[PDB]
A paper describes a structure:
Most of the Mg2+ influx into mitochondria is mediated by the Mitochondrial RNA Splicing 2 (MRS2) channel, located in the inner mitochondrial membrane. MRS2 belongs to the CorA protein superfamily characterized by a highly conserved Glycine-Methionine-Asparagine (GMN) motif in the loop between transmembrane helix 1 and 2. MRS2 assembles into a homo-pentamer and displays an overall architecture similar to structures in the CorA family, with slight differences in the secondary structure arrangement. Along the pore, R332 and M336 have been identified as the main gating residues.
To investigate whether MRS2 undergoes conformational changes in response to environmental Mg2+ concentrations, we depleted most of the free Mg2+ in purified MRS2 using dialysis and addition of EDTA and performed structural analysis by cryo-EM. The resulting structures of MRS2 in the presence of 1 mM EDTA (referred to as MRS2-EDTA) with C5 symmetry and without symmetry applied (C1) were determined at an average resolution of 3.3 Å and 3.6 Å, respectively, with the highest local resolution estimated to be 2.7 Å. Unlike TmCorA, no significant structural changes can be observed when EDTA was included in the sample buffer. The Cα RMSD between MRS2-Mg2+ and MRS2-EDTA is 0.481 Å. In the central pore regions, densities for Mg2+−1, 2, 3 but not for Mg2+-4 were observed along the pore of MRS2 even after dialysis and addition of EDTA which should remove most of the free Mg2+ in the solution. The GMN motif is known to have a high affinity towards Mg2+ with an estimated KD of 1.3 µM36, which may be able to trap Mg2+ in the pore in the presence of EDTA. The conservation of Mg2+−1, 2, 3 and the loss of Mg2+-4, which is just below the R332/M336-rings, further suggests the gating properties of these residues and that MRS2 remains at low channel open probability without activation. While inspecting the Mg2+-binding sites found in the HsMRS2 structure in the presence of Mg2+, we do observe scattered densities in soluble site 2 but not soluble site 1. However, due to (1) the lower overall and local resolution of the MRS2-EDTA structure and (2) under EDTA conditions Mg2+ is not expected to be found in the position that is exposed to solvent, we speculate that these extra densities may represent water molecules coordinated by surrounding negatively charged residues. We have not modeled anything into these extra densities due to the high uncertainty.
Author numbering:
A (entry chain B), B (entry chain C), C (entry chain D), D (entry chain E), E (entry chain A): 83 to 400
Amino acid sequence: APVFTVTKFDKQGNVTSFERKKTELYQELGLQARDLRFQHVMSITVRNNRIIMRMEYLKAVITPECLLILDYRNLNLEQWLFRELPSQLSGEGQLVTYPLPFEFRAIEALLQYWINTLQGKLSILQPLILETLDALVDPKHSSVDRSKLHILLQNGKSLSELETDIKIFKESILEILDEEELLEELCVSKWSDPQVFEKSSAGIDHAEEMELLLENYYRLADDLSNAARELRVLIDDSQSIIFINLDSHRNVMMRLNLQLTMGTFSLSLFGLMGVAFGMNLESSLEEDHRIFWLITGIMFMGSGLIWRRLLSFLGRQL
Amino acid sequence: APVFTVTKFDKQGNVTSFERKKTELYQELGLQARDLRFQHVMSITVRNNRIIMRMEYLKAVITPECLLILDYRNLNLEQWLFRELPSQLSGEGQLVTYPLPFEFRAIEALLQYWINTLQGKLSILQPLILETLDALVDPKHSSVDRSKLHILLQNGKSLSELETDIKIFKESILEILDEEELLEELCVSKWSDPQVFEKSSAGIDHAEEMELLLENYYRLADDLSNAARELRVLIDDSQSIIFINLDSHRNVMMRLNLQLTMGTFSLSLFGLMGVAFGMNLESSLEEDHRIFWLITGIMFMGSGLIWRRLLSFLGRQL
Amino acid sequence: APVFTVTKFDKQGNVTSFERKKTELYQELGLQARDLRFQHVMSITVRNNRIIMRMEYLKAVITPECLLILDYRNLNLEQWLFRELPSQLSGEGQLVTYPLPFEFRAIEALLQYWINTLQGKLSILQPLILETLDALVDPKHSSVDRSKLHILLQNGKSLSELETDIKIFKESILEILDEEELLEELCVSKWSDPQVFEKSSAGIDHAEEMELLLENYYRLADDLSNAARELRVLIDDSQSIIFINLDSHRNVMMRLNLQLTMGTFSLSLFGLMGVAFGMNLESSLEEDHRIFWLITGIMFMGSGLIWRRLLSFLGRQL
Amino acid sequence: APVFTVTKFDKQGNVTSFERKKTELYQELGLQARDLRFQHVMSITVRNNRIIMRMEYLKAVITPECLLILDYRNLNLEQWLFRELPSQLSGEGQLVTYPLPFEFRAIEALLQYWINTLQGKLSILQPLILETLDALVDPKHSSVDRSKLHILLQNGKSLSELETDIKIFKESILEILDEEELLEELCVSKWSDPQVFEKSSAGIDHAEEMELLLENYYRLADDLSNAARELRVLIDDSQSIIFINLDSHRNVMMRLNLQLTMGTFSLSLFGLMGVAFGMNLESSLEEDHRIFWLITGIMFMGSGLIWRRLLSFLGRQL
Amino acid sequence: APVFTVTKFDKQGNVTSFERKKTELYQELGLQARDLRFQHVMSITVRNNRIIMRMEYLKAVITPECLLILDYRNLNLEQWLFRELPSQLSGEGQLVTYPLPFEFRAIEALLQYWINTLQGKLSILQPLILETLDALVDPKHSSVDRSKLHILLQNGKSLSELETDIKIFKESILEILDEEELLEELCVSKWSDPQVFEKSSAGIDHAEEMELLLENYYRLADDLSNAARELRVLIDDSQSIIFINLDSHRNVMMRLNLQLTMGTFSLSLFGLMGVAFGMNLESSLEEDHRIFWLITGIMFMGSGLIWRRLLSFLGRQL
Ligand SMILES: [Mg+2]
Ligand SMILES: [Mg+2]
Ligand SMILES: [Mg+2]
């Protein structure tokens, strides 16, 4: 029998954690097994006057009088759930002239938590990517640190995953924003209690507030998308600059090797005559006392002359 | 006379396989030859109150009282058709409080089978691509394994084909979702029996359930599209990293070759004087007992001195 | 006086070819010179109850009682026009229970001919591109065949032109599909004879059949677009693989050249002492009978020792 | 006081050029300074029953009874304005059965002039780009002509500017086409004279003719956009082919240099023993008359043997 | 207690700067803390008949009778605010026949200031990018200046940020333009004073003027977007040209090094026989007076012959 771990938050901020089976939870919440499947990483749906919304590892169901967190154990949710969420859900402080229903505060808190996690992911990825790209770009080494290439690849993969997460968050919010029926379905207290909504319709709950809230969070996600796209474009531009760094530095060694090759070729060409005169044969010139010094001087001078003439060749032909 | 191989599933899950001609099948189904052409890899159409839908090798026609599978032989469909489809079509288990008509279950089963095949293709492609890219990226070899390049190319081609398949599946579902007339055409039992629909309109069959089903499968296909796009982006990023791996490692050998070229050039330059003094001529210095050792020491020391001076050159010019 | 070469097909499939001037043709067809300009490669328009449609070299005007082909000479249209089009336009065979008007058959025949030509272009381009990319990708040669690069470039240009042709064909069909007024304008016989349409409105001619026909041809063109896009993506991926093939193979020769450079540098370094002892001077060691063999053995052993020590250098520094 | 140079074309094709101030021109035309600012490169607006439209250097205002060209001096407009525009505006020839108002002819003439200039720019850019890419692609040279790279870069920049111009022209036409109010605003004579329009509504001026005219020019601009996009794709493909041309040809020289390095390494390795036996020491073998020839033969044969063995190495290791 | 620095502009252009707390400012403006959060870089909203709009560092709130600038200190706004904004807000000069309300002038002034700042950013970035790309592209150096690569990278990052800023400015303007309710909300004086609007409805304030103003600024931002996109495309094309510059120049040094390698290989091959005859052994040919000169001539001639034969090899094999 599959089971759910449920953390229930009341309208007063009270936190109660219990242990209830899935089949009993369906009857308690007035839902069916197909509603609480949680097979989508980003989904915000309203089934049977219950707001069922999921963000990766954050699965929550919002009821008119309570908020439930499902499958929260061993997911680093032990700090926010018991020290930040009750404060936001209790309604302490803030503007008391227009207290919105519980579902509005629950949706706002969950959306803010997800936007904060996305902002933290981006603000962790950005400095690492910047510090990795600021070292490979620098033209003070012939090659790049091969150890940092794996770090760059992992950071790029994480950035792609973060971009996908922000894109699906934006799509999920925009789906509710565009369709007026979907946005009106979020008014759980209106349909659950159609007699209090008319009496308390003095700005307490209306489509304008939900429109503004969802637009604010969609704009925050759009800002995050713009920042992530800028970071990815920066990664691509830095890689293109590195491609020029490893090619322009190679040409320097090409030129040095070519110059040394000309030098050693001239040296070998003029030492060829020395080897020819070095054979143990009869050259008919061993009696002369000036031929040796003349040959040595000719060799040494012509080596430099041919080296300079060849050095002019690479300066002429580019 | 062209023929069809038909596998018929009744409302009770009974499986009957027979052998009927195309012309007789058109009369039996009340269709024409143009409807059952199956020239599109992904198409879901409703012609003459019959749901004609095709997924690559899966050609099926859904009738109010039966489901037909056409051209199923020799396509690895001998396990699902006779061991999984009857269980899903029989309606055993699940929620008995709202049994939907047969066409809903048939569409759900076919869509789930195609989404499962796409998920299997993706979950087969992903580990191979990851293990191929994790070996070429590693900077422990001067070159990359040329055998794995063909594997990477074939995996990329398969990923492109899978992306096209998921894209056309999403388009086929979204075409039905967007147009309300197309979605209403799926209610085959409503138009076939317009007198039972009104009596059994207590949540048994309505547009909401089909909207939710098609949205669920479109969202599953969208998740698969996101995963495939992430994999393709990872492939491109890994190829860009390999391009830096094969260029930064080349520069290391460039530097080593340049250093050795400077060393051998200095050695040849200082051995030139040894060759000059090695000729079988009169150098006017053979009588001295210290000129040979002085020349040898000068040669050996100046070789290292010129080598160090040239080694400073590549450290100065980057 | 500009002239037109007209091939006229009657409702009975009769083919009559005559020679009529443009000015007289305008009066005969009830059109103006601006209608029959044919300045667009892909255009399907209905002017003055005449369907004027053009596909590159295929210019045709459809009339209620006849179909005209304009400028057909010397364009390889001498086989289809007189051996395939009359059979399709005669209405022989097929379903006789619902004979559509002549304009429907003419539009279907022209659209099918263009889709067949596009399919032939794609099925000619694909094998050549595949066989060209299967040879350069193979890592059995240091370089790639430079002759096949021009073939690849021409095939890529032809693929781009084919993609543009399919894109404009899809756009032309979708323009008619989206606007209901444009699709209703195709019912030439309805507006020409508003008294037979009502009497023969028993499924003979209605918007459903034209919608299905145009959707079928748009889906065929979409399949061709998907295939062409897959081929282009394959071309790009294969080029990226070749870029790794010509860079990883270069590193192999880099390593071999570096190893040989270390070997020859060690050989020169240890032959330097042999050259130093080879001078025609007084080394004060010519009387010893063991110095020569000791020096030779030291040279030969130290050459290999230094070669191994340098070979360890490239294995340590990657 | 800022001034305007105005060229006025009457309904009879008369050309009058005068010199009027901006402030007086505003009163004469019944406009304000904000209307005649001409700060947009591509804009077609109708302000106060006056069609104010601008195309880069072509600024014109269309009035019910006249057409004005503003700032035409020193812009190579001295041929079209006084030798082509009056002929088109006079209405000579053409179809006299349906003469449209003056504003239609003026808009058609200006749009045709701009489309002709864009076509000329494209037909000038295309041959130069083709002839530049047909020389660098050819694999008959080790390198590419560095002089033609600047020509290619300038042609690419000009192609990008032309693509932007055609894109903004298409956007300007489509803005009028999509909104029916904007298209109806072009009927200047209808609003200026609401009593002649009803009497002369027998096909002289209606929305159909303007729709067809703007659609024709939008389709011409779309054809130009397709051609420019094909040219840009061809440029990118040719650059990718050149990248393979400069890398596959480098590998040929790599292989030749490696082969020569093996040859010279074998030569040095076997000449090491000759240098060792060439020292001026006691080798204890000078008395033998066959050791010298044996050593020389061993050297010469082993040089080739080691060269062949090393040549097998690059054939084994790819 | 958080505080705001407010610069208040009256309808007469008077500038008053004071120091008011956020909580008191909310009561004075009739707003709440959630309205004046300024968490979006580009946002234009109308809350409680107050136009709250922000552009990066420019935060302003527009009231029916005054304009407030918030957080203006130490942001280089001390020149425009006190020397340009009062002149524009005073309404001096211009067309006095149709004076629009204060909110129109304030929105126009703020939008013009932001468009001027964006134009200045673009006109500063463009010359630097052009001068940087005009030096690396030039094929007069083997390598590119590594110092200018960092300048190019920083300029590319700044261009990406500018493109994002212009994109979000265009989106913010288009959001107001598309929705008629949002544009009507900008008429602050209409809702604040619903009795003066009807009396002064003689062209003083209507939707047409705001539509034209927002369209003008959206078109200016679109021109800036086109220019920035052209600059980015130019950057990419120039980088692609540099990639050919550093590869075609490398091949020149490849060819020179190969030619010198052939020369030195021929020299070593023919000096091998000189070394063989140079050994201190019995060659049985020392008595001949012509063998030495013959060997030397053969060596010198065959060196050049083999060099030419090898030079033909690279001319044959490309
Ligand atoms: Mg080398
Ligand atoms: Mg050497
Ligand atoms: Mg000697």
